[PDB]
RNA sequence: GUAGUAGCAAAUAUUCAAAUGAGAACUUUGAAGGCCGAAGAGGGGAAAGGUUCCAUGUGAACGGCACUUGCACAUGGGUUA
RNA sequence: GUCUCCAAGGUGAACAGCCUCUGGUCGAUGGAACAAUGUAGGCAAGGGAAGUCGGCAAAAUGGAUCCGUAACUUCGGGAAA
RNA sequence: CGACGGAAGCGUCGCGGUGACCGCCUUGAAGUACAAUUUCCAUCGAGCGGCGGGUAGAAUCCUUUGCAGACGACUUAAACGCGACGGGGUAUUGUAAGUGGCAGAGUGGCCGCCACGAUCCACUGAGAUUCAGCCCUUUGUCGCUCCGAUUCGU
């Protein structure tokens, strides 16, 4: 018989199945629709979720309740140190899908990134693309990698650069082994791709190249992983009364006689967290470049010199050095891991998409406990030097 | 470089000891310098002296001390087929004046 | 077959050194840290049991892990009105 | 499950509970991890029985001193109202 | 060798080299006695003995990490960095012990002195704790830098 009540179910049938990622670095599952009418230029970049904080900024919002009033929102640090492109990959539009046609790699490879194709890197020779960079000292071998990359422009539809993160620089990761992904590169025609990929070998895009200030952005990476777990936590079914028999935190009923089978609908207890996920719609509020008053937390109302990283270090990720992205709002992972940052695939047209940043106040006060402190200068102070 | 060796360690069992059951905290302590010494001299058999026993279970099972300065002496058994050449005797060792405080890892001398 | 699976989880708790031994988380000594807390986990007796008492020794079995151990096994001793 | 004798110090009204001395004892197979579900013990913003057949369970009250104590009543009580 | 072919191109075409067929010539077929699979192809795969050329690694266990975790698994680390102390940063509590006081309700002796006194004040936002899954790090101290094991081939 039908059920008593009406409420709609527990969970989401659409992020199944529930289990571990088959990967740790976030997998880009679509690029944005290519332009050719536009200049060439990168659609994603690899980040390190560090911390958050919260700040202080004055809302334009005509009709609204905020306009010209002041709101506080939390934010993301995602430290984003340039990438270094170290190869090329051509795909062609078959009947059967994208199929890679060919990769070519660039003469010189830093050791961080030739510990990705280790297990132990130590432990190896270190053989790692030796053979191929010597075909770069031979005017036969250059005119065979000039022949390949002729031979991208003739057939590849889709062009991807290989960057790799320089995860050496951001000491509190501990990490030496870097991060390497496919960027797909959009604009221009297939040989302004190639061009545009192989004028950059061993060179570095900053996170300005891809992103900027004010647009919005998805986030993808792996949530926080929180092994096995019961369905009241995992699914968020309600708890049974206090008087039930062999435990409270279960679903009761899970199927009818018929079928005579339990449906994959229902319910059940396993992993938790550790799920791939891909966020639509992040503003970026500030890009701080390394050199420039824009890498520090002063506001055109606040002065106080001071940089982005609380005092005491971000917790658990430590000081940041290097180009960052403020984002607004909450970010996929734990502290230390690495995000894709990609480009919209919509059409951004709303009036928050559009809307201008302008922040106030920087919190910078120690996030491992009740700070009361923005800088070391002022706790010392206050303590007459301690 | 030299079998028999000699220094002088402060032990951080707060940290080592943190989230451990009441019941099993001080014997989890022996566990622990067990491990140190095996450790930072490498070898399998260690010896814990009584007096420094005695140390870990004075405040009871459950308060062991956060620190703790222990002198640690590798040396040679010389018992008929002993099943390791070394072993460790891991003893307790006197605090200076000032305490803990800027007291690093001391070598001791003959 | 089930299956080396269910299961060993009440009565707060053990640790260090040395001795003995083929073999020691489990025997013994010493030191420490705990418990019973006198309506006791202390010291006796009535029923009931019947040698379980004591010493020495011990291949196996048994003491639902283990044992060098013993209320087990072997030999001997022990209850005086 | 099974009759009975002896019975220290402190706190306190108290062979209550809690801690200790004499005496006894650490005998309950151990080791490593700290998922779900469970068993036992807890806590919780704002609301306060809306939960549920039903306040089930839990919480709240609790000792002592002084003040004060209604209906009703078989005049004794009710009353620690 | 050259060009072309990317939808799975693994093929096509051109030039040169070379064999066969064909052309011409020569010679043979039987008694294999009336049929008995007309064994002989390419598709890789090879397994071996030789003759040349080419190549001179990884994975896993043990250890480590906690961005992971029931166990497996997973993310890290393994001659320079790592590890153990210590220091600084950060945070929690709320001002340590000792010393001194012409602070302290008072009280007991002596002839102001002495004894008792909870508490109070100064040194003292002091002392204690702070990664165990916090941040930086030799001013400074110390150690270790790898004995091994199991496999894997077109
Ligand atoms: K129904
Ligand atoms: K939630
Ligand atoms: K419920
Ligand atoms: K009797
Ligand atoms: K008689
Ligand atoms: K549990
Ligand atoms: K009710
Ligand atoms: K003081
Ligand atoms: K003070
Ligand atoms: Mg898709
Ligand atoms: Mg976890
Ligand atoms: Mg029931
Ligand atoms: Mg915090
Ligand atoms: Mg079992
Ligand atoms: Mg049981
Ligand atoms: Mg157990
Ligand atoms: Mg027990
Ligand atoms: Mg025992
Ligand atoms: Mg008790
Ligand atoms: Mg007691
Ligand atoms: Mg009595
Ligand atoms: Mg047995
Ligand atoms: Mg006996
Ligand atoms: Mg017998
Ligand atoms: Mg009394
Ligand atoms: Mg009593
Ligand atoms: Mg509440
Ligand atoms: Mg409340
Ligand atoms: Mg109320
Ligand atoms: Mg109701
Ligand atoms: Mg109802
Ligand atoms: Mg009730
Ligand atoms: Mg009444
Ligand atoms: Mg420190
Ligand atoms: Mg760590």
Same mark, same amino acid.
């Given at each position: 018989?039908?059920?008593? @009540?009406?409420?709609?179910?527990?969970?989401?049938?659409?992020?199944?199945?529930?289990?571990?990622?088959?990967?740790?670095?976030?997998?880009?599952?679509? @690029?944005?629709?290519?332009?050719?009418?536009?200049?060439?230029?990168?659609?994603?970049?690899?980040?390190?979720?560090?911390?958050?904080?919260?700040?202080?900024?004055?809302?334009?919002?005509?009709?609204?309740?905020?306009?010209?009033?002041?709101?506080?929102?939390?934010?993301?640090?995602?430290?984003?140190?340039?990438?270094?492109?170290?190869?090329?990959?051509?795909?062609?539009?078959?009947?059967?899908?994208?199929?890679?046609?060919?990769?070519?790699?660039?003469?010189?490879?830093?050791?961080?990134?030739?510990?990705?194709?280790?297990?132990?890197?130590?432990?190896?020779?270190?053989?790692?693309?030796? $053979?191929?960079?010597?075909?770069?000292?031979?005017?036969?071998?250059?005119?065979?990698?000039?022949?390949?990359?002729?031979?991208?422009?003739?057939?590849?539809?889709?062009?991807?650069?290989?960057?790799?993160?320089?995860?050496?620089?951001?000491?509190?990761?501990?990490?030496?082994?870097?991060?390497?992904?496919?960027? !797909?590169?959009?604009?221009?025609?297939?040989? !302004?791709?190639?061009?545009?990929?192989?004028?950059?070998?061993?060179?570095?895009?900053?996170?300005?190249?891809?992103?900027?200030?004010?647009?919005?952005?998805?986030?993808?990476?792996?949530?926080?992983?929180?092994?096995?777990?019961?369905?009241?936590?995992?699914?968020?079914?309600?708890?049974?009364?206090?008087?039930?028999?062999?435990?409270?935190?279960?679903?009761?009923?899970?199927?009818?006689?018929?079928?005579?089978?339990?449906?994959?609908?229902?319910?059940?207890?396993?992993?938790?967290?550790?799920?791939?996920?891909?966020?639509?719609?992040?503003?970026?509020?500030?890009?701080?470049?390394?050199? !420039?008053?824009?890498?520090?937390?002063?506001?055109?109302?606040?002065?106080?010199?001071?940089?982005?990283?609380?005092?005491?270090?971000?917790?658990?990720?430590?000081?940041?050095?290097?180009? %960052?992205?403020?984002? $607004?709002?909450?970010?996929?992972?734990?502290?230390?891991?690495?995000?894709?940052?990609?480009?919209?695939?919509?059409?951004?047209?709303?009036?928050?998409?559009?809307?201008?940043? $302008?922040?106030?106040?920087?919190?910078?006060?120690?996030?491992?406990?009740?700070?009361?402190?923005?800088?070391?200068?002022?706790?010392?102070?206050? %303590?007459?030097?301690? | 470089?030299?079998?028999?060796?000699?220094?002088?360690?402060?032990?951080?069992?707060? $940290?080592?000891?943190?989230?451990?059951?009441?019941?099993?905290?001080?014997?989890?302590?022996?566990?622990?310098?067990?491990? @140190?010494?095996?450790?930072?001299?490498?070898?399998?058999?260690?010896?814990?002296?009584?007096?420094?026993?005695?140390?870990?279970?004075?405040?009871?099972?459950?308060?062991?001390?956060?620190?703790?300065?222990?002198?640690?002496?590798?040396?040679?058994?010389?018992?008929?087929?002993?099943?390791?050449?070394?072993?460790?005797?891991?003893?307790?060792?006197?605090?200076?004046?000032?305490?803990?405080?800027?007291?690093?890892?001391?070598?001791?001398?003959?």
């Amino acid at each position: 018989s039908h059920r008593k @009540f009406e409420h709609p179910r527990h969970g989401s049938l659409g992020f199944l199945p529930r289990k571990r990622a088959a990967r740790h670095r976030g997998k880009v599952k679509a @690029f944005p629709k290519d332009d050719p009418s536009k200049p060439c230029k990168l659609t994603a970049f690899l980040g390190y979720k560090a911390g958050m904080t919260h700040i202080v900024r004055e809302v334009e919002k005509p009709g609204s309740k905020l306009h010209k009033k002041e709101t506080c929102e939390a934010v993301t640090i995602v430290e984003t140190p340039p990438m270094v492109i170290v190869g090329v990959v051509g795909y062609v539009k078959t009947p059967r899908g994208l199929r890679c046609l060919n990769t070519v790699w660039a003469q010189h490879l830093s050791e961080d990134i030739k510990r990705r194709f280790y297990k132990n890197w130590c432990k190896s020779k270190k053989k790692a693309f030796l $053979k191929y960079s010597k075909k770069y000292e031979t005017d036969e071998g250059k005119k065979d990698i000039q022949a390949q990359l002729e031979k991208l422009k003739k057939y590849a539809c889709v062009i991807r650069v290989l960057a790799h993160t320089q995860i050496r620089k951001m000491k509190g990761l501990k990490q030496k082994k870097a991060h390497l992904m496919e960027i !797909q590169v959009n604009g221009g025609s297939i040989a !302004q791709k190639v061009d545009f990929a192989y004028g950059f070998f061993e060179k570095q895009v900053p996170v300005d190249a891809v992103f900027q200030k004010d647009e919005m952005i998805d986030i993808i990476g792996v949530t926080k992983g929180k092994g096995y777990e019961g369905v009241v936590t995992r699914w968020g079914v309600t708890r049974l009364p206090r008087k039930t028999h062999r435990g409270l935190r279960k679903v009761a009923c899970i199927g009818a006689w018929h079928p005579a089978r339990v449906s994959f609908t229902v319910a059940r207890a396993g992993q938790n967290g550790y799920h791939h996920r891909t966020e639509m719609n992040k503003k970026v509020y500030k890009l701080g470049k390394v050199g !420039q008053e824009s890498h520090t937390a002063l506001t055109e109302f606040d002065r106080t010199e001071k940089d982005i990283t609380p005092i005491g270090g971000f917790p658990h990720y430590g000081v940041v050095k290097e180009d %960052y992205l403020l984002i $607004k709002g909450c970010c996929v992972g734990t502290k230390k891991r690495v995000v894709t940052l990609r480009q919209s695939l919509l059409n951004q047209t709303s009036r928050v998409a559009l809307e201008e940043i $302008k922040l106030k106040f920087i919190d910078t006060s120690s996030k491992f406990g009740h700070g009361r402190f923005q800088t070391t200068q002022e706790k010392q102070k206050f %303590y007459g030097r301690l | 470089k030299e079998e028999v060796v000699s220094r002088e360690y402060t032990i951080n069992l707060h $940290k080592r000891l943190h989230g451990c059951t009441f019941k099993k905290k001080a014997p989890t302590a022996i566990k622990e310098i067990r491990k @140190f010494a095996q450790k930072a001299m490498g070898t399998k058999d260690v010896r814990v002296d009584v007096k420094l026993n005695k140390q870990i279970w004075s405040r009871g099972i459950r308060s062991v001390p956060r620190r703790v300065r222990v002198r640690i002496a590798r040396k040679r058994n010389d018992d008929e087929d002993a099943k390791e050449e070394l072993y460790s005797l891991v003893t307790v060792a006197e605090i200076p004046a000032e305490g803990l405080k800027g007291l690093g890892t001391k070598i001791i001398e003959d």
